[PDB]
Design an enzyme around this catalytic site. Structure first.
Site, mmCIF file in Angstrom:
data_model
loop_
_atom_site.group_PDB
_atom_site.id
_atom_site.type_symbol
_atom_site.label_atom_id
_atom_site.label_comp_id
_atom_site.label_asym_id
_atom_site.label_seq_id
_atom_site.Cartn_x
_atom_site.Cartn_y
_atom_site.Cartn_z
ATOM 1 N N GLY A 189 13.455 10.962 2.908
ATOM 2 C CA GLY A 189 13.583 9.606 2.387
ATOM 3 C C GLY A 189 12.510 9.206 1.386
ATOM 4 N N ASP A 190 11.347 9.858 1.441
ATOM 5 C CA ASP A 190 10.309 9.643 0.413
ATOM 6 C C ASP A 190 9.586 10.949 0.149
ATOM 7 O OD1 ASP A 190 8.769 8.388 -1.511
ATOM 8 O OD2 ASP A 190 7.587 7.187 -0.101
ATOM 9 N N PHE A 191 10.351 11.930 -0.319
ATOM 10 C CA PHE A 191 9.885 13.313 -0.410
ATOM 11 C C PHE A 191 9.101 13.493 -1.718
ATOM 12 C CE2 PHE A 191 10.262 17.996 -0.365
ATOM 13 C CZ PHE A 191 10.022 18.232 0.976
#
Ligand SMILES: NC[C@H]1O[C@H](O[C@H]2[C@H](O)[C@@H](O[C@H]3O[C@H](CO)[C@@H](O)[C@H](N)[C@H]3O)[C@H](N)C[C@@H]2N)[C@H](O)[C@@H](O)[C@@H]1O
Ligand SMILES: Cc1ccc(-c2nn(C(C)(C)C)c3ncnc(N)c23)cc1
Ligand code: NA
Length: 263
Positions: A189-191
């Site tokens: 999701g926030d790679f």
């Protein structure tokens, strides 16, 4: 039955003798403390969320708890939720971020990207039947709409190609890229390069998992691809090559980059 027998059954002693530092100073969200310099005890991180942000810290706690069964993650030492506050205490993953190691070892760029791609494949390989979290585009779009309407979107942090765009223009233009084919994998999701930790030359874990859930694999590929664009087009291309995609879907890539503008 109401057995009605009178019986009877924290965070203070978990923190005895640590030095306190306040981290990630100019970033939004939860206040982050690094706890260190206590002899014979591991480095720890403490997140504190107040108000709406407490919900974000709570989201992160349950995703850490779930995902740790499958991937290398910080360990929850302690979590407290009160009506207006959330405190999350975790063990630090030792090392430096992908971003840090890339800047420190420019020649290691290709090895770093290969490791990130392999790690991403591992995460995306977790069967979705295991995952209790929904992070799909329908859910994220509604979240984005609320953030825009609540006045929370950082319009000065848009990507260069949307520099100076009114948030409403991004919203409208993003909807023109829909619909696209359903793909569902377990995503981070926030790679970003900030959220992957390298130690002694090896990728040993990921952090900041509050957006974990089932979503399109491009949710992760897009954000990372964007980060690599600060460094080189060849590192960006290599990400997709190592991951195993012949023809990066530029529509999905653009959609997920536009969507992240709202967050
Ligand atoms: N608001 C809170 C969020 O702030 C950042 O996210 C933002 C990105 O940083 C932006 O992109 C910029 O920074 C990238 C490196 O991070 C660069 O490669 C890129 N060229 C830059 O335009 C992107 N436009 C919007 C996205 N919301 C954090 O990562 C995220 O964790 C945090 O929740
Ligand atoms: C340079 C640097 C290195 C690590 C971290 C970091 N942040 N955070 C959060 C924010 C998830 C508590 C971490 N959580 C566990 N382990 C970590 N190592 C970190 C931050 C900056
Ligand atoms: Na784990």
């Amino acid at each position: 039955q109401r057995e009605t027998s009178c019986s009877r059954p924290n965070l203070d002693a978990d923190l005895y003798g640590y030095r306190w530092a306040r981290d990630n100073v100019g970033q939004s969200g939860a206040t982050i403390y690094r706890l260190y310099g206590k002899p014979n005890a591991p480095e720890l991180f403490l997140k504190h969320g107040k108000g709406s942000v407490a919900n974000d810290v709570t989201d992160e706690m349950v995703r850490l708890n779930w995902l740790t069964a499958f991937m290398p993650l910080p360990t929850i030492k302690h979590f407290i939720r009160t009506p207006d506050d959330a405190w999350l205490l975790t063990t630090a993953i030792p090392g430096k971020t992908a971003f840090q190691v890339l800047e420190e070892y420019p020649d290691s760029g290709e090895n770093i990207v290969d490791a990130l791609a392999v790690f991403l494949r591992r995460l995306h390989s977790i069967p979705v039947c295991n995952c209790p979290f929904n992070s799909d585009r329908v859910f994220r779009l509604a979240q984005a709409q609320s953030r825009m309407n609540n006045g929370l979107v950082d319009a000065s942090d848009f990507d260069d190609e949307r520099n100076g765009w009114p948030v409403e223009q991004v919203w409208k233009e993003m909807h023109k890229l829909l619909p696209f084919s359903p793909d569902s994998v377990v995503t981070h999701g926030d790679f970003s390069l900030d959220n992957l930790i390298f130690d002694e030359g090896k990728l040993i874990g990921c952090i900041d998992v509050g957006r974990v859930g089932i979503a399109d694999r491009y949710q992760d590929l897009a954000i990372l691809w964007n980060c690599l664009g600060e460094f080189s087009p060849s590192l960006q291309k290599r990400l997709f090559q190592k991951y195993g995609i012949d023809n990066p879907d530029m529509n999905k890539l653009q959609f997920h980059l536009m969507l992240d503008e709202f967050f």
